Amino acid sequence: MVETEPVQGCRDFPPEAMRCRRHLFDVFHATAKTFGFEEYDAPVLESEELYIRKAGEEITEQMFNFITKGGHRVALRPEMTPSLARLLLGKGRSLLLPAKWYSIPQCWRYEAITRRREHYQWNMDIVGVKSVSAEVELVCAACWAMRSLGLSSKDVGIKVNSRKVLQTVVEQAGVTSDKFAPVCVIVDKMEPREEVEAQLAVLGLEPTVVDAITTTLSLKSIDEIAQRVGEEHEAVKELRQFFEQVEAYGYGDWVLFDASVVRGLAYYTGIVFEGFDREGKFRALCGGGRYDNLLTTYGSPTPIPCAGFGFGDCVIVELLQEKRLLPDIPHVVDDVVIPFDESMRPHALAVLRRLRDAGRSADIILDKKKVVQAFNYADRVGAVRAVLVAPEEWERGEVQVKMLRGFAVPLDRLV
Amino acid sequence: MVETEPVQGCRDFPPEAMRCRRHLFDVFHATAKTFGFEEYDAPVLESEELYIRKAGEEITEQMFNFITKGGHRVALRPEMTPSLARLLLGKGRSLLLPAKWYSIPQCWRYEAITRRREHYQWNMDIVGVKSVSAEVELVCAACWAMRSLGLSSKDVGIKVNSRKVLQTVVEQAGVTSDKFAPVCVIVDKMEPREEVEAQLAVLLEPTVVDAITTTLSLKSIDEIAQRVGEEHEAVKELRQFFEQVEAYGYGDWVLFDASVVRGLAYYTGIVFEGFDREGKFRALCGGGRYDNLLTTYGSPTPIPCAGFGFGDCVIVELLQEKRLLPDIPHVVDDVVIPFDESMRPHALAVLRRLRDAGRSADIILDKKKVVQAFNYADRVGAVRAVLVAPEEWERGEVQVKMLRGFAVPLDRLV
Ligand SMILES: N[C@@H](Cc1c[nH]c[nH+]1)C(=O)O
Ligand SMILES: N[C@@H](Cc1c[nH]c[nH+]1)C(=O)O
Ligand SMILES: Nc1ccc(Br)nc1
Ligand SMILES: Nc1ccc(Br)nc1
């Protein structure tokens, strides 16, 4: 017998599981459409050179990579943002801005544990908008998706911060700019306190510079940030604008400030955010931020402002299961056409044709079955209606219909 | 600068191209739903052992395979049917039959060219149905999809045959059953006549080759009946098939062709493939019955299956030729325009309302003068522009313009 289990760390989606995934994706698509984002896609296979950022990111550390027969370094994408940037850079001058693009790529990782190696990740990005209205819209989109799935602001929130605060603190200490990305990557690991301080020292930062970083991540309000860097610091004005705009849109209860949020990606320059459950039970539900320099690093002759997020398919489902918002969605079909016997099969097919022409989902019983077994089958597939095509009714230009006693119905009136 | 081109043989789908792909997939999904099939999926990465069939298939010859860091032989799936079989075999007794399952996997191949290495392929399969009604439904589904895209029976058809005819001819000649799959794979190659005869010899004497050649050239079912009898399984089944398609109303879409075998080892019965009537393109779709596959995978009981694959590349070329793929421009219901930044908070409340009512809506995100905001609305294909200006706002109103303006109460926007 062949191996029935899927490849290590990968999921199968038989129909039952697929209906769940589809319920989730319906919301991602519908939210994107509500917010005016355009779908795109790109190959799961990208050049490895695309992901070499040299900041010690977990995402680059766990690349699912391999060498082609031709000898080229490729990888199954660990994330989508670089692919997006490649596409944007390809279009160059011909891309109309602003652009709002989304996708739901499967993304990949390798880990030596004998644990998940793939997930699907909703990506939403806004390109060509300098102002915080982008981040506002993005955070609202994430909340909208969660609310659409049945969650409330009692269940979840979005923690919001700006990396510009830390930038200034690190830059005031005399640390070269190139160290800033590594610092964010290290400080993201705070969620072992001694080991984080140790890694920062290896980066070449003295104890007092580490102290200033620690203190600023522990400041619990925007006013406290204001005391440290000033009320007219870019981060303060922008964070204030952000919260004012989310409040105006009606999602104020969903969002809050948290100075410890930095995210683990090298490329965020400004506002960063992540979704979380209010019970403190799960990892991040989604994550994102502004990354205004990425396209410049890729060689764009002009700077292109970008912001966006990723929203995974695994943590959200666990949360929905906990909150009892993922009831089993059973299969449905409008009609099941039942030939009384094989001599009625041709007539039954004409009926089936009609039903499908009118936009109805319909089965016909394919093998030889007795009527009552055909009826049981109809119930198993969740048919709303059984349509028995029997010789007596057929001579009267009729069929028998039963909603799941029967009724005789003219053919013309079935649809 | 980084490489902007995608990896060799792979396609990018920026929004314009993605809208085309989505138009196609909408039809695949909608056809599956119309026909009562259930969606499934499985990993693009499968074990290589899953595809080692040893019949010289093109599909096994061109596997995109590699070795993990852990040392396991894996591959990006060249097709979906083995993955389907794996899932079916996993469920075993607990799967309710009949089952009708579909998916739209990306599938992969490696070729030493300078040419496509990936395509998307609609798969539709019926599991647990012994009778030709399965193949009927499958062929009708394919036609339905093509008709849904704007094609007619003047544009395309489905050639249909049964491998059982050839089975009998080969088996009458004394050829061991294990040679039958290789014979089909070879005979599928009929488009170089001398080289096909040569490959069969490496496998069968000249007179056995002669009988194979003649039977592929027979132009009707009655002619098949003369050779193997009207009681031969292939004859009865093909007759039933055409009778059922006729009854469903797709008789003009289908026809008999004794040269159709397909290139896959596993087909046991009816096989079919879609084609354009102008003879310009490769096969549009292909499939057949494969009643032994699950048995080869170790199923303790035989499980009848039939299905097809329907690629995303040839169909699009055909639709482009027939001028059935007009550019689909982006659309959005509303574009909310703040008169200036002091109106942004009010504009956001309006945006919220519009979206609450099920409308697709943008708000102008950066600082723009009104006329530039309006131009932007037109570019994104907005049906309606909603200007939120201080004067109207004090009256509990906004300005609306369908793409002169009108003042409208907030309550009446939706
Ligand atoms: N690529 C980020 C998410 C993101 C999308 N756009 C911006 N950020 C991640 O994987 O966490
Ligand atoms: N796997 C086949 C198509 C198919 C699906 N089901 C049965 N046949 C192919 O790629 O040609
Ligand atoms: N980056 C990444 C990829 C795949 C999974 Br599962 N999680 C994270
Ligand atoms: N089997 C297969 C795979 C990929 C492409 Br492109 N064509 C055929």
Side-chain angles (χ1 to χ4, degrees), chain A residues 1-48 50-68 70-95 97-113 116-153 155-178 180-190 192 196-198 200-202 204-205 207-236 238-282 284-327 330-391 393-404 406-415, chain B residues 1-48 50-68 70-95 97-112 116-153 155-178 180-190 192 196 198-202 206-209 211-226 228-235 237-281 283-326 328-403 405-414:
Chain A
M1 191 185 292
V2 310
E3 181 58 62
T4 58
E5 295 301 324
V7 163
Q8 166 53 234
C10 301
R11 293 165 298 168
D12 288 332
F13 297 87
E16 50 271 47
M18 192 66 202
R19 282 189 302 260
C20 170
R21 171 170 144 191
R22 189 52 71 194
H23 169 82
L24 185 56
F25 287 25
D26 286 353
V27 172
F28 294 158
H29 287 295
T31 296
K33 178 175 178 190
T34 293
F35 279 63
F37 283 60
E38 297 180 74
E39 199 175 16
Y40 73 103
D41 190 20
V44 69
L45 222 63
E46 291 276 22
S47 180
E48 187 191 81
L50 199 53
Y51 307 100
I52 296 177
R53 294 201 282 265
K54 309 183 190 171
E57 296 163 279
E58 172 169 305
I59 205 161
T60 59
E61 285 177 352
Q62 310 205 323
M63 262 199 309
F64 203 128
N65 56 9
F66 62 90
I67 306 172
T68 63
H72 287 349
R73 312 269 296 181
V74 297
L76 298 165
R77 66 191 165 211
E79 50 159 342
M80 200 55 170
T81 311
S83 293
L84 171 61
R86 186 177 56 75
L87 266 47
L88 295 168
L89 184 73
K91 290 183 166 301
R93 188 141 159 176
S94 75
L95 179 51
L97 296 176
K100 315 202 293 180
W101 285 20
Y102 88 96
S103 193
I104 317 181
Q106 192 172 43
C107 296
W108 291 82
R109 74 187 177 177
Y110 186 96
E111 272 185 57
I113 292 175
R116 288 227 56 69
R117 291 186 180 172
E118 56 75 26
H119 68 164
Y120 285 85
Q121 190 196 50
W122 182 33
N123 281 247
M124 293 268 283
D125 290 85
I126 301 179
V127 183
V129 175
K130 298 182 176 176
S131 91
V132 300
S133 59
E135 290 100 320
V136 168
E137 172 135 303
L138 290 162
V139 167
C140 290
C143 295
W144 193 273
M146 290 188 295
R147 203 169 194 289
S148 297
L149 294 153
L151 294 164
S152 80
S153 61
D155 298 319
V156 297
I158 312 290
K159 290 161 168 166
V160 184
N161 189 24
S162 181
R163 276 183 176 190
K164 292 179 181 171
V165 180
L166 205 59
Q167 193 190 344
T168 300
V169 172
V170 168
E171 179 168 345
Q172 278 169 347
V175 183
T176 307
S177 68
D178 57 17
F180 178 55
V183 167
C184 292
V185 173
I186 291 166
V187 165
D188 177 64
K189 306 168 174 188
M190 199 69 101
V196 172
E197 290 186 337
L200 290 166
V202 172
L205 289 63
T208 58
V209 182
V210 170
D211 189 27
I213 289 164
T214 302
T215 302
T216 68
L217 301 161
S218 304
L219 300 179
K220 310 300 184 187
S221 70
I222 297 167
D223 293 341
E224 281 171 296
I225 286 12
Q227 289 182 59
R228 182 55 146 279
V229 293
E231 187 65 38
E232 311 284 324
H233 191 265
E234 277 181 41
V236 180
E238 289 171 340
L239 285 166
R240 295 243 195 251
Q241 281 168 355
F242 173 94
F243 287 102
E244 182 184 343
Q245 287 181 39
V246 171
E247 175 86 352
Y249 190 76
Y251 276 145
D253 294 330
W254 290 72
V255 304
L256 57 113
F257 173 72
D258 189 330
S260 78
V261 173
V262 300
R263 307 300 300 150
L265 292 135
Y267 47 68
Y268 299 122
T269 53
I271 284 183
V272 291
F273 56 89
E274 55 178 52
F276 71 98
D277 74 288
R278 305 260 181 180
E279 298 177 351
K281 290 202 187 183
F282 305 102
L285 300 165
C286 58
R290 179 161 289 274
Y291 55 105
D292 282 354
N293 293 345
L294 188 58
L295 278 282
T296 293
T297 69
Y298 284 25
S300 180
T302 186
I304 302 179
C306 306
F309 69 77
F311 190 129
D313 76 328
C314 291
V315 186
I316 185 71
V317 166
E318 298 184 329
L319 173 59
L320 295 166
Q321 289 175 334
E322 197 227 347
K323 297 288 187 166
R324 291 163 50 69
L325 295 171
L326 271 194
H331 187 255
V332 301
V333 65
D334 298 324
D335 307 305
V336 174
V337 179
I338 304 171
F340 178 85
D341 59 20
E342 289 306 307
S343 78
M344 297 309 293
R345 182 165 293 281
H347 298 324
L349 283 165
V351 172
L352 188 69
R353 176 62 187 279
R354 289 181 66 101
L355 293 176
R356 293 175 173 160
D357 283 344
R360 292 174 73 77
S361 58
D363 293 329
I364 183 164
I365 298 292
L366 293 169
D367 250 18
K368 225 187 134 190
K369 276 193 201 220
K370 293 140 193 184
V371 165
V372 51
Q373 280 68 51
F375 268 101
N376 184 243
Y377 181 77
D379 185 78
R380 300 274 186 120
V381 302
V384 173
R385 195 166 70 158
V387 178
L388 174 66
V389 184
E393 284 68 35
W394 186 265
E395 288 186 33
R396 302 154 149 167
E398 295 177 340
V399 291
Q400 290 212 18
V401 169
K402 180 152 176 164
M403 309 303 298
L404 315 187
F407 319 107
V409 179
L411 266 48
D412 275 28
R413 310 272 64 122
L414 280 167
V415 300
Chain B
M1 192 184 293
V2 310
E3 181 58 62
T4 58
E5 295 301 325
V7 163
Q8 167 52 234
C10 302
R11 293 165 297 168
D12 288 331
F13 297 95
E16 326 85 88
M18 192 66 201
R19 282 188 302 260
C20 168
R21 171 170 144 190
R22 190 51 71 193
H23 169 82
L24 185 57
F25 286 25
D26 286 354
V27 171
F28 293 159
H29 288 296
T31 296
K33 179 176 177 190
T34 293
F35 279 62
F37 282 60
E38 298 180 74
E39 198 175 15
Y40 73 104
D41 192 17
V44 69
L45 222 62
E46 290 276 23
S47 181
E48 188 190 81
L50 199 53
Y51 308 99
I52 297 177
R53 294 201 282 266
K54 308 185 189 171
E57 297 162 280
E58 172 170 303
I59 205 161
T60 59
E61 285 176 352
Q62 310 205 323
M63 262 198 309
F64 203 129
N65 56 10
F66 61 90
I67 306 172
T68 63
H72 279 59
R73 312 269 297 181
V74 297
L76 298 165
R77 66 192 165 208
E79 50 159 342
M80 200 56 171
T81 312
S83 292
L84 171 61
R86 185 176 56 74
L87 266 48
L88 295 169
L89 184 73
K91 290 183 166 301
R93 264 206 210 193
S94 75
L95 179 51
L97 296 176
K100 314 203 293 180
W101 285 20
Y102 88 97
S103 193
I104 317 181
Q106 190 172 41
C107 296
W108 290 82
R109 74 186 177 178
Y110 186 96
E111 271 185 69
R116 289 229 190 272
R117 292 185 180 172
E118 55 75 27
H119 68 164
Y120 285 85
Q121 189 196 50
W122 182 34
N123 281 246
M124 293 268 282
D125 290 84
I126 301 179
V127 183
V129 174
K130 297 183 176 175
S131 91
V132 300
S133 57
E135 290 100 319
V136 169
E137 172 135 302
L138 290 162
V139 168
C140 290
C143 294
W144 193 272
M146 289 187 296
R147 202 170 194 289
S148 296
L149 294 152
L151 294 164
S152 80
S153 64
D155 298 319
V156 297
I158 312 290
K159 290 161 168 166
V160 184
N161 189 24
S162 181
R163 276 183 177 190
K164 292 179 180 171
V165 180
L166 206 59
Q167 193 191 343
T168 300
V169 171
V170 168
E171 178 168 345
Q172 278 169 346
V175 183
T176 307
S177 68
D178 57 17
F180 179 54
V183 167
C184 293
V185 172
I186 291 165
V187 165
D188 177 65
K189 306 168 174 188
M190 273 300 190
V196 171
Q199 273 192 43
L200 290 166
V202 172
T207 58
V208 182
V209 170
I212 290 163
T213 303
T214 303
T215 69
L216 301 161
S217 305
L218 300 179
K219 310 300 185 188
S220 70
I221 299 167
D222 292 342
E223 281 172 296
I224 286 11
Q226 289 183 59
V228 292
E230 188 66 38
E231 78 281 9
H232 194 268
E233 276 181 17
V235 180
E237 289 172 337
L238 285 165
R239 295 243 194 253
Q240 280 169 351
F241 174 91
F242 286 102
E243 183 183 343
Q244 286 181 40
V245 171
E246 176 90 334
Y248 190 76
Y250 275 145
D252 295 332
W253 291 70
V254 305
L255 56 113
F256 173 71
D257 190 330
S259 79
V260 173
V261 300
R262 308 300 300 151
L264 292 135
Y266 48 69
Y267 299 122
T268 52
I270 285 183
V271 291
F272 56 88
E273 54 178 52
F275 71 98
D276 74 288
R277 305 261 181 180
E278 298 177 351
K280 290 202 188 182
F281 305 103
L284 300 164
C285 60
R289 178 162 289 274
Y290 55 105
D291 283 354
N292 293 344
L293 187 57
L294 277 283
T295 293
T296 70
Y297 285 24
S299 180
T301 186
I303 302 179
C305 305
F308 69 78
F310 190 130
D312 77 328
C313 291
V314 187
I315 184 71
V316 166
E317 297 186 327
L318 175 58
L319 294 167
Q320 290 175 334
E321 197 227 348
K322 297 288 186 167
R323 290 165 50 70
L324 295 171
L325 271 194
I328 303 144
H330 187 256
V331 301
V332 65
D333 298 323
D334 307 305
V335 174
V336 179
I337 304 171
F339 178 86
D340 58 20
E341 290 306 306
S342 78
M343 297 309 293
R344 182 165 293 282
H346 297 324
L348 284 165
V350 172
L351 188 69
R352 175 62 186 278
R353 289 179 194 99
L354 293 176
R355 292 176 173 159
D356 283 344
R359 292 174 73 76
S360 58
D362 293 331
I363 183 164
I364 297 292
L365 293 168
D366 248 20
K367 282 173 75 84
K368 277 193 201 221
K369 293 139 194 184
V370 166
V371 51
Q372 280 68 51
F374 189 84
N375 183 246
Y376 183 77
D378 187 77
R379 299 273 187 121
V380 301
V383 173
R384 194 167 70 159
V386 178
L387 174 65
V388 184
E391 180 195 37
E392 284 68 36
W393 186 264
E394 288 188 32
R395 303 154 155 166
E397 295 177 339
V398 291
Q399 291 212 19
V400 170
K401 180 153 177 164
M402 309 303 298
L403 316 187
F406 319 107
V408 179
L410 266 49
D411 274 29
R412 311 276 76 151
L413 281 167
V414 300

